[PDB]
């Protein structure tokens, strides 16, 4: 054999940088982070506090509330009227959510219980739902249109608000159900089955989910909002990450005038109790929040940044003195 090549790689002498964790390179960063995470933590905290939010719980699990009568609905159509007041008028677009507590939408036996190909608008998969949605694959002789547990247990309460003015006449509040789902889900992931023009014919030879009261045909009068592309359907099928979640329900756009969208006063929430959750100690809530340029209302991030900024700054001082002690 012959002389090895005198290449930088072969001889272990590639040009390289030797970083040393010196007091002039780790102390400043522990301070730069300290001086950045404090302002960010302060900005996050105050902005989230500025947000106006009202959370109304209407599960009716405990007595002395005007919804316990619906806990045992002798008659299926049951209604509750929860009264609440707004200390300060809301401004800008106001978002309506429905929050479910102790509702494991992230359970493995539940997250997988759906047929993505079917919901994508696949003709072949419409009549042959996959084994993933097995327990709700077929009802009597023909397959479910939105098979699976995820589509079966769809939140089916109807929440309505009324403003109680001087005349005490409940003024209905406009609620836009359009544009509450992810754009990609609305136009990419979820698509109606091809063929025909009227969805009645598209879903030929398919039954409704077992729990659903009415088929997918008329989830909405608008042809754009009914089918697999329904906004409420899509929002529910986007399974949550933790047992406690909240899904967008309705939008309350800014009023054309300068007046606040929800002027402060007395309000009444009219809810058609349909969704039962009291069996597994679940809670149901209606949340109203206001648009914010910094996402939503997240106090925890503001606290965390302050804690890390303080700890980082404190560590810089502790490291600085230790270095001086051992200098």
């Amino acid at each position: 054999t012959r002389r090895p090549d005198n290449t930088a790689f072969k001889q272990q002498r590639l040009p390289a940088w030797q970083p040393i964790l010196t007091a002039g390179t780790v102390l400043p960063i522990f301070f730069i982070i300290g001086l950045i995470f404090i302002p960010i933590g302060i900005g996050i905290f105050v902005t989230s506090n500025n947000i106006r939010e009202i959370e109304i719980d209407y599960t009716g699990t405990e007595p002395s509330s005007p919804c316990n009568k619906c806990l045992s609905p002798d008659v299926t159509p049951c209604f509750c009227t929860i009264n609440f007041t707004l200390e300060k008028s809301f401004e800008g677009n106001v978002f309506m959510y429905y929050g479910l507590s102790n509702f494991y939408q992230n359970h493995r036996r539940y997250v997988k219980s759906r047929d993505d190909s079917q919901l994508n608008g696949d003709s072949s998969a419409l009549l042959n739902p996959s084994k993933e949605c097995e327990p709700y694959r077929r009802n009597e002789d023909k397959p479910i249109a939105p098979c699976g547990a995820i589509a079966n247990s769809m939140f089916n309460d109807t929440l309505e608000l009324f403003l109680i003015g001087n005349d005490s006449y409940p003024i209905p509040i406009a609620l836009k159900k359009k544009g509450i789902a992810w754009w990609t889900d609305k136009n990419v992931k979820f698509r109606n089955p091809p063929g025909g023009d009227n969805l009645e014919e598209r879903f030929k030879g398919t039954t409704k989910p077992v729990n659903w009261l009415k088929p997918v045909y008329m989830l909405d009068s608008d042809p754009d909002n009914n089918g697999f592309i329904n906004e409420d359907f899509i929002v529910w099928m986007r399974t949550a990450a933790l047992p406690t979640f909240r899904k967008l329900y309705r939008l309350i756009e800014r009023k054309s005038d300068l007046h606040p969208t929800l002027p402060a006063g007395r309000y009444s929430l009219n809810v058609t109790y349909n969704y039962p959750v009291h069996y597994f100690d679940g809670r149901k809530r209606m949340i109203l929040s206001t648009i914010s340029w910094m996402g939503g209302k997240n106090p925890f991030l503001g606290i965390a940044y302050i804690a890390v900024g303080s700890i980082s700054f404190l560590l810089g001082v502790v490291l600085l003195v230790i270095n001086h002690k051992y200098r």
């Binding site: 090895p4 390289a16 494991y104 933790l242 967008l248 100690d281 939503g296 980082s312 051992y326």
Partner: protein, 1125 residues
């Protein structure tokens, strides 16, 4: 009782035909043949044993068993998550990656064997000799060898060019001996198998002993010409022998292949596994146990969950009536799947890749490449790299490893004046003195580099005739032969010492020209003066001196004797004015690590010789005890010898040997010199190598045995010597057997015997390991392995074996790391070795650079590998409390597959190949950095749990910081990323950044590829998933809260790490850290300096530096006509 001059092979029928291959190929011999082919096998995978034997060793690894278990589990339909047609391929893919790397090494050594099987020695396979590869030799082939031709196999010397079919062979490979030994042949075979034609028809039968490991003696018989002719070891040329000073010799192959006596002395090949290989097994066992506990802990939690919450959850109805206990049992296997990546599939492909890359840095090193012989290093096994940085003991050879097998005549004390120093004219002038001019001498050549002009004028001037007689003695007292076939006047010296002296005396003017059974024809300063030899008093180990009695042309009779300083000083005349001065010179030469012989002569009268001559003849003629009777008449004449002077022959060491030993002594590596050479030669090279200094007090086998009997008797632990002293051992091979005891009621006493032997072997290792140096001489190849074994068994030490030749194969195969000295003609130790470089000094870089880094790099890889997997995999464990312990992955399905192979694979592979704490120049200069590998400090079983605790804590922050920011409102709008898919891409995004910023903190050598892979992996994740996107990251990572959570999660994960790293460096800096801080201010690096002067006064002879490699029987050849044409 034990003998200090013999190698103890004892303490460790066959039939052959001639030119008659068919007969001894008979079915009765055949077994399923009893006779082996002359080909040598060293590789492992021949044709088809690759799969059964590569996989068997493949599954010696813990995780390979682990992956196999997962494969079987994933094939069970009720719990299987994958199709089973894509989970087996990754196991095959990685197994093929390691199998291929093992095959490229095997084919490399298969080619190496072909080099020795293509040596092309002539054989009789037709009416006349025909060239033939070595492997084309079968037991019973008459062969022919020329000068300097390695003997293909143990052969019965039939004839030769020399008179009486003499053949001189050097056995420096079979044993460390550096001199030539003559092998005779049967008189009948000598006078009837000379001509080439008669060899072909030779039809002889040999009934000899079955193949054995006894190189010293051989018992057999030859039936030929209707008569039986006994054989002995003096007619058999072993396999490793090299034929010297013989134009051609004819032999009959007795054994061949693995039947050769040297090949039987090669140990058994064993599968060598690194120390960290054993650690990685226990570490995978630990993770497997933790995986079972966590899965069973979460499986119980699920059952307690389905009992009250799950059974009441109407939305969690699946139409299968399963009891909560059964559901929990069934999710136990669901967590085994989920948490399996806690030890990924790429653990061994990465370790496989790192070692392949590192072992190629050994091959490519230009500082380990010997240009003179054009021989680079070679890591012929690419599975033992980190262990080079864990060596505790080095067991070396000597002849050919620590020495160049070159002896030169350095100095000479004459009449008390020491000659050899740098001098000019009649007095010293300057150190810068040019080489002496020998042009005035017709016979002299330029090989002798003598830097002294004072001696030359003394030779030429002649005012001090004793100077002339000093060199006439060196030219007469020898027993070498002379070749003048073309007027070259070449000397064929059996002993290297005789060659150096006779050549040295030839250059000074007194040249030995011709020899005869009765006369010698030395020429003195151009004058041809033919002396008459009257008796050559042969040399033997116990005599330690050779003498010659000659009659000068005038008529006077003189006796010339040269030998050990001790034996001669007991025979000097009472009147010797130079006795004191010469004794001082022998002390000066002894202090310089040279081989000293004293020269003396006496004046013999005509009448005094005649009475002694008749006595001498009566001793020679008496064949009953010719050797014993001769020694008596030898002593009768060597009574009053006038002292002439001394000599000093310097056994040259390989360059760098004394420096390497000192450097590896600072690295705390103990070097033992296990050699098969004589005791005087082995002891001298210990002094030349600086292993033994005047500070050390040397203990021999006699002293060691006495100490060990004391402890045996005391008991019927305490140090054998005082702690502050400096000591060394020179244990002969015969004394090593003596001190190690290696020289129904039948089975009952066996335990006490073995219990006694086991205690005595442990005591010796504790005695040997308390000494600064240990030299074992006259040891068999089996004894070389035994000493390595004892150190492994009783000191639990990593051992390195370095040597050349066949005798060093056993300890090369027995040591943890086995190095072979390549570049020479003999390649027996190279094939069986693990690494191979041409020079001893290159051991500095193998350990202090390649070995030291390989440990640092493998440990850094191991520390980070089990980080970035617990951090990734324990997120599924923390999520289990918030999904009903349902075994739901916190990440997307695609992320899990690509994480271990595409998002965190490359960064750590490049670290394992390129990282460097200190420069190579700065790691040789500071050998003390090596002790970190001795003690196993960089990766303990406690550093393994600290990395686990690093991933366990990192996983908590990776999951619970995104959780805290999501339990509340997080960017709640139309495109609100509060769902599970947005959950997955925040922890995955934070995870990828955190682990890839951690390898940046770990890396201390930021090459461009190091920086490119760290950010290339981060950028690859943020780009690759977009190709998949359905559309989860298109909205999750565009939100200010999803990026304020990712930044916060990373900062909390890395800032505490940086603080701990800085504190531990500021408070308890390592050896490497101190050197990096002062790297620029380090300038004083003095080259290694030999101890220039250790001169002392007070003791007449503190140490006898005598050394002479020579053998008996050579004088008997000249006395008769056996060696004379």
């Amino acid at each position: 009782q034990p003998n200090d001059e013999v190698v103890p092979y004892s303490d460790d029928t066959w039939q052959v035909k001639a030119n008659d291959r068919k007969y001894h190929e008979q079915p009765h011999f055949m077994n399923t043949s009893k006779y082996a082919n002359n080909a040598i096998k060293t590789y492992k995978y021949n044709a088809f044993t690759f799969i059964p034997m590569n996989l068997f060793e493949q599954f010696k690894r813990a995780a390979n068993l682990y992956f196999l278990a997962l494969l079987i589990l994933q094939a069970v339909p009720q719990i299987s998550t994958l199709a089973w047609y894509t989970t087996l391929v990754p196991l095959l893919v990685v197994l093929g990656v390691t199998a291929i790397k093992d095959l490229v090494d095997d084919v490399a050594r298969h080619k190496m064997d072909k080099e020795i099987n293509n040596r092309t020695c002539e054989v009789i396979k037709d009416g006349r000799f025909k060239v033939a590869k070595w492997k084309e030799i079968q037991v019973g082939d008459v062969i022919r060898l020329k000068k300097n031709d390695f003997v293909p196999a143990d052969i019965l010397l039939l004839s030769s060019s020399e008179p009486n079919s003499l053949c001189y062979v050097e056995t420096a490979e079979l044993d460390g001996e550096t001199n030539l030994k003559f092998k005779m042949s049967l008189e009948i075979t000598d006078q009837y198998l000379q001509r080439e034609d008669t060899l072909a028809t030779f039809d002889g039968f040999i009934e000899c002993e079955e193949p054995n490991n006894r190189l010293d003696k051989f018992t057999g018989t030859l039936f030929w010409r209707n008569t039986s002719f006994p054989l002995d070891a003096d007619k058999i040329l072993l396999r490793g022998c090299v034929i010297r000073n013989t134009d051609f010799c004819h032999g009959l192959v007795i054994f061949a292949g693995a039947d050769t006596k040297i090949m039987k002395n090669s140990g058994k090949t064993r599968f060598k596994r690194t120390k960290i290989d054993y650690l990685m097994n226990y570490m995978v066992y630990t993770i497997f146990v933790v995986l079972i506990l966590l899965s069973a802990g979460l499986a119980i939690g699920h059952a307690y969950w389905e009992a009250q919450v799950g059974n009441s959850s109407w939305y969690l109805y699946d139409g299968e009536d399963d009891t909560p206990s059964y559901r929990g049992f069934l999710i136990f296997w669901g967590y085994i799947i989920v948490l399996n990546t806690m030890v990924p599939i790429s653990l061994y492909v990465s370790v496989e890749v790192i070692r392949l890359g590192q072992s190629h840095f050994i091959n490519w090193d230009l500082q380990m490449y010997y240009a003179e012989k054009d021989t680079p290093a070679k890591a012929r096994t690419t599975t033992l790299n980190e262990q080079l940085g864990q060596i505790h003991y080095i067991f070396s050879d000597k002849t050919g490893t620590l020495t160049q097998n070159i002896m030169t005549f350095k100095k000479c004390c004459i009449n008390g004046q020491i000659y050899g120093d740098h001098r000019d004219a009649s007095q010293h002038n300057h150190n810068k003195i040019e080489q002496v001019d020998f042009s005035w001498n017709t016979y002299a050549d330029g090989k002798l580099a003598f830097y002294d002009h004072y001696l030359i004028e003394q030779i030429q001037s002649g005012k001090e005739p004793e100077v002339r007689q000093f060199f006439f003695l060196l030219a007469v007292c020898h027993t070498v032969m002379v070749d003048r076939t073309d007027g070259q006047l070449n000397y064929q010296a059996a002993s290297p010492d005789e060659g150096a002296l006779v050549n040295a005396a030839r250059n000074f003017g007194f040249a030995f020209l011709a020899r005869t059974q009765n006369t010698i024809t030395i020429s003195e300063l151009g004058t041809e003066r033919t002396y008459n030899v009257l008796a050559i008093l042969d040399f033997n180990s116990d005599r330690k001196r050779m003498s010659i009695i000659v009659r000068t042309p005038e008529g006077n009779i003189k006796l010339y004797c040269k030998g050990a300083d001790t034996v001669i000083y007991e025979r000097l005349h009472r009147m010797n004015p130079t006795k004191q001065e010469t004794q001082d010179a022998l002390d000066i030469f002894a202090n310089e690590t040279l081989r000293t012989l004293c020269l003396c002569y006496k004046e013999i009268e005509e009448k005094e010789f005649t009475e002694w001559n008749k006595k001498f003849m009566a001793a020679s003629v008496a064949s009953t005890n010719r050797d014993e009777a001769l020694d008596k008449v030898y002593e009768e004449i060597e009574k009053d010898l006038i002292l002439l002077g001394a000599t000093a022959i310097e056994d040259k060491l390989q360059d760098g040997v004394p420096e390497t030993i000192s450097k590896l002594a600072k690295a705390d590596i103990k070097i033992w010199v296990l050699t098969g050479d004589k005791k005087e030669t082995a002891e001298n090279i210990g002094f030349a190598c600086e292993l033994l200094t005047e500070d050390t007090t040397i203990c021999y086998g006699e002293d060691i045995n006495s100490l060990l009997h004391a402890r045996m008797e005391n008991q019927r632990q305490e140090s054998f010597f005082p702690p502050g002293g400096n000591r060394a051992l020179i244990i002969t091979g015969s004394w090593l057997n003596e001190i190690l005891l290696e020289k129904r009621m039948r089975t009952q006493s066996k335990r006490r015997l073995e219990a006694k032997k086991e205690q005595r072997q442990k005591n010796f290792v504790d005695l040997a390991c308390e000494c600064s140096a240990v030299i074992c001489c006259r040891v068999t190849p089996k004894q070389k392995a035994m000493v390595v074994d004892l150190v492994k068994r009783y000191k639990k030490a990593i051992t390195l074996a370095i040597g050349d030749g066949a005798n060093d194969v056993n300890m090369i195969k027995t040591a943890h790391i086995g190095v072979g000295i390549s570049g020479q003609e003999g390649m027996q130790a190279v094939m069986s070795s693990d690494y191979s470089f041409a020079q001893f000094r290159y051991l500095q870089r193998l350990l202090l650079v390649h070995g030291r880094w390989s440990y640092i790099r493998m440990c850094k890889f191991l520390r980070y590998f089990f980080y970035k997997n617990f951090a990734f995999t324990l997120v599924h464990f923390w999520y289990s409390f918030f999904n009903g312990y349902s075994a739901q992955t916190a990440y997307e399905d695609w992320f899990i597959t690509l994480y271990n192979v595409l998002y965190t694979s490359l960064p750590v592979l490049l670290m394992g190949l390129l990282d460097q704490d200190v420069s190579d120049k700065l790691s040789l200069r500071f050998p003390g950095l090596y002790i970190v590998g001795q003690r196993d400090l960089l990766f303990n079983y406690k550093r393994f749990f600290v990395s686990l605790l690093h991933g366990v804590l990192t996983s908590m922050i990776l999951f619970f910081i995104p959780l805290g920011a999501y339990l509340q409102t997080v960017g709640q709008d139309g495109e609100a990323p509060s769902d599970y898919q947005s959950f997955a891409v925040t922890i995955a995004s934070a995870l990828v950044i955190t682990v890839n910023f951690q390898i940046g903190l770990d890396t201390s050598y930021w090459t461009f590829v190091n920086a490119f892979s760290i950010f290339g992996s981060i950028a690859l994740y943020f780009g690759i998933m977009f190709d998949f996107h359905t559309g989860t990251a298109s909205n999750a990572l565009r939100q200010p809260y999803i990026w304020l959570t990712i930044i916060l999660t990373v900062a909390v994960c890395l800032l505490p790490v940086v603080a701990i790293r800085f504190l531990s460096m500021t408070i308890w800096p390592s050896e490497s850290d101190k050197i990096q801080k002062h790297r620029k201010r380090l300038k004083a690096e003095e080259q290694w300096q030999r101890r220039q002067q250790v001169f002392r006064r007070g003791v007449s002879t503190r140490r006898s530096a005598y050394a002479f490699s020579h053998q008996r029987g050579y004088a008997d050849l000249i006395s008769s006509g056996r060696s004379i044409r």
